Design a protein around this ligand. Structure first.
Ligand SMILES: [Cu+2]
Length: 120
């Protein structure tokens, strides 16, 4: 199945957001990232994707279709707006083995706050 995500300058959580910022998927699903506002992209965060998953980085302003294979949690960011808290969490399969690790990892305070919220 496909899950559509919008990249926006402003949303329910404030400025520079992914909506939804919490994506539940299963191996084989696709996640479509739509740049509703210009200036955004999607990129996997180093050591914040499952072991065996390939790193990815879309072009600014392009519609990007991500196919998810490996189970686990993935924290993605918008390259330009990471420090402004523009992130999304993709959870593939049940009880992502690396979720606690991602929660604990070093990241910007704004990012951490949004993540905690998304997770809750
Ligand atoms: Cu952005």
């Amino acid at each position: 199945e496909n899950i559509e995500v919008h990249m926006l300058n402003k949303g329910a959580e404030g400025a520079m957001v992914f909506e939804p910022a919490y994506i539940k998927a299963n191996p084989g699903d696709t996640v479509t990232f739509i740049p509703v506002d210009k200036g955004h992209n999607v990129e996997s965060i180093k050591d914040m994707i499952p072991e065996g998953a390939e790193k990815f980085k879309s072009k600014i302003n392009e519609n990007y279709v991500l196919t998810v294979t490996q189970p686990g949690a993935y924290l993605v960011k918008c390259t330009p707006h990471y420090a402004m808290g523009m992130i999304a969490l993709i959870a593939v399969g049940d009880s992502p083995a690396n979720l606690d690790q991602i929660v604990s990892a070093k990241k910007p305070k704004i990012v951490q706050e949004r993540l905690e919220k998304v997770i809750a």
